[PDB]
Structures are given as structure tokens and as C-alpha cells.
Design a protein around this nucleic acid. Structure first.
Lengths: 165, 102
RNA sequence: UAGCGGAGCGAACGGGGAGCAGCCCAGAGCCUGAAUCAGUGUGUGUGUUAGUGGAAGCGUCUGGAAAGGCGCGCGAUACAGGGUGACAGCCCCGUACACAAAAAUGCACAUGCUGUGAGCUCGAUGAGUAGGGCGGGACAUCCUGUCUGAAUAGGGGGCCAUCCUCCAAGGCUAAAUACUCCUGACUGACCGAUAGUGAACCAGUACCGUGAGGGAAAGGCGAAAAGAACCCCGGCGAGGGGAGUGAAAAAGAACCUGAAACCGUGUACGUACAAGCAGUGGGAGCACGCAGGCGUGUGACUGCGUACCUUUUGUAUAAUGGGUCAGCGACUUAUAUUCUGUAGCAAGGUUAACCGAAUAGGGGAGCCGA
């Protein structure tokens, strides 16, 4: 499974089981719901019943979690929501530069994931509400679905595949 | 650090008297300022035998929120924002937008 | 689980982690006072207790008022949040970020002084003690008030040894752990005035009780009091009618919204020869609103018609319960276990604690299956 880049227009072949797997709606629904339930602080009580603080955390099998990532990640390729570039960085930590760098690419709501997070890139995108920046190690299933487009650097895709399959 | 003092010419940004200018009579601790000729109200002050034997309807000035007024430059003829720097050991106000010292 | 007991109670070894530190005395000499620990200043750092700077917006429409709509710009290491006459990244306070301390003080070092001894050598190696007796206590076992009494490198454990392992009869000991009256910050598929703490309000108050103690109700004018000058009726009242303020007074303080029961005034129709769950089917007339009937309200007359609930086989020619309205008010949470559905991987499945600011990954100790 090779995807054509934008700047260099080259290819990067990856296992179809990663970027070309079927969409498991039930599996994705389970994992996405699990993440949302895991983040809530269920602290409440009354004082006819009365509530107690509770843990909404659910278990996700290590292999089962990766399987959900493959299905959503593959769906991005089929939906053409995945843009791959060789290089993506800014000279200085200025959000204005990030805005100009994005309108040229015709991207408004984008998730930018990089192999090695740059300090300037992170700071520049901090004040852009529709732009999020992650590192290859710090990717998250919910984020990959929420954002309209996903920009990945050449290093990131290589790291992601070895981390996934 | 108030950006407005007792003696200052200001222009009302919003309200019944938007655009009118006047001199601040005094500033209240509640975040409001009284400006000459702004926000006139008609108080029906009932006479009291001890003082103010005449009654009648009396026009008086009502306080205005400090956020509803801005320092009037009088050079550009429009509202302006105030910045604070440390000059010669006393931090004074200056007009942003050409950064001129009052 | 091993076991103890029926109901129930419940290890240890061992393994994986958190944290790790073991010291001096039981006595002398040498050597020096050398590490180290305490007291104590003194310098530096790093906080804490005040603070300082902190980017960028105008035009027009509606409106009581612009932050809203529309149009055209700008800042962003700052689009956390709050306020401003309606909903503000660019009005205000802030925020990101960068700085700040005369004084006190936390915490690390550096160093001053004091007190303290490290290094090496040699020895010692816990006595009315180990043990045993008596009388009790507590459950053959344990404890001891009383009396007796060793060996001491040999002594203490594991019918007998074996073999292994240990050294009582002195003391000290950080870290990993528990908890939160109190303080700060943040968070919430938490409540929003009959809720949430009993208490959003001058609440542990008023009130109740001799007392311990029990224990309420009660939030909201408006952007701004601009809280109604003046006039009129009235008792120099209460209350009202004007006027005036305001976008709004049917926002007037008994003040946002203003439901229902309940009480009236007005209009339409019916009703004083007509018998009972009061409705339902048919239906004249009247009033009104719409090519001649329909609609809305009323309902003369007429067919049919044992209130509802619970108990009970049953609704009963029985008994029970409810004055009405509004509000509150009952299969919740955790754990174990079983089944069904569904999803993952597959003869393998899966990790727990924990590490890791990290939901990733590591961790295979264990568990169930083959």
C-alpha cells in the first residue's frame, strides 16, 4: 500500500493490513466510546437514593486497540483524508506563519502529526483552534476521526506502521 | 494602572451618548466614571424641610462604566487605548497607536 | 486456595513491584581528631508571602443600549476566564510570555564556628540470663506472681540422628504507608432555591425543650434609582388617578417570568311541572363567525347508562381510601457469579501491581485454555 505525496509526489509502500483494512464499525464504536467514557470524572453524591463517585474506565485489549487504529487509519486513505509530506516545519514559533503555511495548502481543519515534534511548530499551532499537532508516539484514535484532514510527515508514517503492524 | 484619572477628556464608546466627549468629573470604585454632560438623568428629588426647600425635577449626571469610555487623543480625533511603560522612574501613560507620551 | 467451620472465617512458602541502609554499644590501644551526624551563623541558588510590562477594530443595519447581522482589516508563545446597556481574540480586567523583594521564611548546596568523632589494629560477643520447679491466669499449648539456675564459638532450631541454618539474653534506624479539621489550585455526562450542606439570605439563627438536644422559613425592580418632583381624591392617612422617569411601571419596591386549584365582573345560551355517576347517540331553538348550509358556544326534548381505587373468585342492592391544586416521592451502586448478544485474537487468549506524563509503550508475575 503506497501513497503518493504532495510536495515530492513520491511513494511510500506500507502493509495493506495497516492502511487497507476493512472498517470495523463495531470495533471502532467500542474503542471510541471507551476513550470518551474513560475521560469523565464521575464525582457526585446526594444527601430516595444517593450517588457515589465511580470509575467509568474500561479495558481495551492491547491488540484490539491497534486493530481499531488500523480500521480508522485505513479509512482515511480510502476517504482521501490522509495527506503525506516529506517535510513540514516553520522557521519561528509564530502562529501567523502557521496560518499562511496552511492556507497555501488549502487546509482549515487539520491534524498535523510529526515523527519528531518541533518546538516552533507546537507553539505556533497552540492558538489555532482548528489545528492540532501531535507526535508519532502520541497519536490518538479520537483525534484521527475528529479532524477533517490529517497531515503526516514521511518519518511519522514509517514510525506509525512499526508501532501498529 | 487605571488608564483613566480624575482629570481627563474622554469619548463615550457605547451607550445613549455614543460619540460624545466630556471631562471626567470623578471615578467611582465600582468601575464607573462620571463624565460632564454624559448620561443625563432626571431625578425627581422630593423636597426635605431641613435642606433644599425647592423640589422640582432636577437633571443630574449618572455614572458610566469605565469600559464604555476611552481616552480622547484630540490629535487623530478618535478613541485610543492606553499603554504603560516605565519612564525616568515613574511609569506614565502613553497613547498606543503612535505611542505618544501624554 | 491450604486449612478452620454448617452459616461463614481464612493463611504461609514462593514470585512480580514500590522503597532500600543498615549502624553503634557490649573495651582497650594506636592514630589523631580526618568521614559523618546535630547546633549555629554566612554566601549562593531556588521558591513562598506584595507586584510590573503584556499584542491587535473600524464602517454600517436593527435597537432603549452592540459585544449581534452585514462589510472590510488585524494580533495570536496571548481564541483560559470574567466584566462591560444583547453573544467581544483586537473596550476593560486578564491570559501566553518576560521580569520583580527592603523584610521574613521554606528547601538544596557552598563555606565559617561550635559539639561530635573517622582510619587502622587487637580483643570482647550480652546472668540470676538460657533453662527448670511451684501456684495462678490465658487457651497438651500460651502468659507469669513466686522460687531456683547453665554452657558461654559454645549455644539456639529443625524418637533419633542427619544435614542445613542461625547466634538470644543492649540500643538506635531514613525511604516506600495511613489520614485531612485546615489552605490553595483545578475538575465534574453534579444540584440550581421543595434541589444542593440543616443553613445561596446576619443559620445552627428564629423557634421548641429544665436540660442533653431538636431545628426551620426566607434568593431575583432596572443597564443605570433615573425609587415616581408636582397636581388631584382622602384623615397633613391607607389606597388610588394623573404627571414624570424608563425600552418597558401589566418592571413601582407586596417589584423578572407569573401555571393550577380558588374568587369575581362582563357577554352568549340554558334553567322556576321537573327525579338518580351528570356523560354519550340523535337533536330543535338562540347568539356569533362564514352561496346554504357548514363552523364555534349553548343543549329544550329523547335512546342508552350501578363513580373510581384496593381487598375479594368477583366491579359487588358489601368493606376500604382520597377536600382540591401545585412540587417532591420506589429495582440504585459495588462486588461475586451465571446466561445471551456482540467484538478482538486464536491453540493460544490476556496481563495485575508497577514503570512511563503516559490513555502510547513497557511489565507475562500470574490466570484460564490447549
Amino acid at each position: 500500500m503506497e501513497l503518493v505525496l504532495k510536495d515530492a509526489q513520491s511513494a511510500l509502500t506500507v502493509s495493506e493490513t495497516t492502511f487497507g483494512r476493512d472498517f470495523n464499525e463495531a470495533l471502532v464504536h467500542q474503542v471510541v466510546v471507551a476513550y470518551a467514557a474513560g475521560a469523565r470524572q464521575g464525582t457526585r453524591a446526594q444527601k430516595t437514593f444517593a450517588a457515589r463517585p465511580q470509575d467509568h474506565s474500561q479495558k481495551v485489549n492491547k491488540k484490539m486497540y491497534r486493530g481499531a487504529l488500523k480500521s480508522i487509519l485505513s479509512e482515511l486513505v480510502r476517504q482521501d483524508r490522509l495527506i503525506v509530506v516529506e517535510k513540514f516545519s516553520v522557521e519561528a514559533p509564530k502562529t501567523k506563519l502557521l496560518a499562511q503555511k496552511l492556507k497555501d495548502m488549502a487546509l482549515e481543519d487539520v491534524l498535523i502529526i510529526t515523527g519528531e515534534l518541533d518546538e516552533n511548530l507546537f507553539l505556533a499551532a497552540r492558538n489555532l483552534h482548528k489545528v492540532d499537532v501531535r507526535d508519532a508516539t502520541g497519536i490518538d484514535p479520537v483525534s484521527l476521526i475528529a479532524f477533517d484532514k490529517v497531515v503526516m510527515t514521511a518519518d511519522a508514517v514509517k514510525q506509525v506502521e512499526e508501532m501498529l503492524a | 494602572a487605571a488608564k483613566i484619572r480624575r482629570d481627563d477628556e474622554v469619548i463615550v464608546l457605547t451607550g445613549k451618548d455614543k460619540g460624545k466627549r466630556g471631562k471626567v468629573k470623578n471615578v467611582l470604585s465600582s468601575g464607573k466614571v462620571i463624565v460632564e454632560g454624559i448620561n443625563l438623568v432626571k431625578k425627581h428629588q422630593k423636597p426635605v424641610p431641613a435642606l433644599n426647600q425647592p423640589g422640582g425635577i432636577v437633571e443630574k449626571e449618572a455614572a458610566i462604566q469605565v469600559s464604555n469610555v476611552a481616552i480622547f487623543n484630540a490629535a487623530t480625533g478618535k478613541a485610543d487605548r492606553v499603554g504603560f511603560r516605565f519612564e525616568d522612574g515613574k511609569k506614565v501613560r502613553f497613547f498606543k497607536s503612535n505611542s505618544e507620551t501624554i
